[PDB]
Amino acid sequence: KIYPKLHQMDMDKVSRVYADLRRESISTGSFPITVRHLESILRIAESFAKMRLSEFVSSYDLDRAIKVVVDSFVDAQKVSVRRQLRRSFAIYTLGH
C-alpha cells in the first residue's frame, strides 16, 4: 500500500557522501562504490519511510540510510585504514 517519495531530500548531503565514498573507494581491494550504491542510499531511505508508513522520506530516513551505507563501506576495510576512514566520514554521520 505504501509508496514513499523523496520530497525535498538533501541532494548535496548525498552527493558529497557519494563523492567521498568514491574517492576513498579508489583503494583497489575495497568494496566497489558504484552508482548503484548511490541508488542504494535512496532505496534504503524509502524503505525506512516505508517502515513509518510514510508518504514522504524525511531527513532522518535519509540520514539513517547514509549511516547504514557508510558503516557498510567503512567496515569492509583492512584495519590499518579503518580508523582514518571512520574519522573522515564522521562529518556526514555524526550530525545525527
Partner 1 sequence: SVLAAANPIYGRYDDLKSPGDNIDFQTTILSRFDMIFIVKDDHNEERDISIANHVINIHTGNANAMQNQQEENGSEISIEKMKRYITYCRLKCAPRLSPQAAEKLSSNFVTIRKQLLINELESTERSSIPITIRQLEAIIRITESLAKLELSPIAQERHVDEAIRLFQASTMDAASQEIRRFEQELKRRLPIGWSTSYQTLRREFVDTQLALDKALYALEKHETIQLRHQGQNIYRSGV
Partner 2 sequence: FRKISRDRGIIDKIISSMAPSIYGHRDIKTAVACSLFGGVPKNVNGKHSIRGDINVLLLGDPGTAKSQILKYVEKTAHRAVFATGQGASAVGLTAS
Partner 3 sequence: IQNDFDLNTSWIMNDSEFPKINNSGVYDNVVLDVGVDNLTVNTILTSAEFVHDAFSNDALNVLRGMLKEWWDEALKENSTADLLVNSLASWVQNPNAKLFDGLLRYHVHNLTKKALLQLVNEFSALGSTIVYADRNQILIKTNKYSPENCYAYSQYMMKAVRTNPMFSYLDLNIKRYWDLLIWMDKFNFSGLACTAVSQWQLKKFLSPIYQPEFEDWMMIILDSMLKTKQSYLKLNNSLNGFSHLFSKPLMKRVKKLFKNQQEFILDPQYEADYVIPVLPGSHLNVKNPLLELVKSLCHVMLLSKSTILEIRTLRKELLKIFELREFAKVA
Q: Which residues bind partner 1 (CB under 8 A)?
A: 5-7, 9, 11, 14-16, 18-19, 22-23, 25-26, 32, 34-35, 38-39, 42
Question: Measured from the CB atom, is 30 or 59 closer to partner 3?
Answer: 59
9 touches 61 (CB < 8 A): no
When binding is defined by CB under 8 A, the residue of 50, 55, 82, 85 that contacts partner 2 is 50
Instruction: Please report how many Cα atoms fall inside a 13 Å half-sphere around the Cα of residue 35, on the Cβ side.
Output: 0
93 touches 67 (CB < 8 A): yes
Residues 7-36 touching partner 2, rule: CB under 8 A, are: none
When binding is defined by CB under 8 A, the residue of 30, 52, 59, 86 that contacts partner 2 is 52
68 touches 37 (CB < 8 A): no
CB atoms within 10 A of CB 43: 11
Question: Measured from the CB atom, is 42 or 76 closer to partner 1?
Answer: 42
Question: Measured from the CB atom, is 12 or 28 closer to partner 3?
Answer: 12
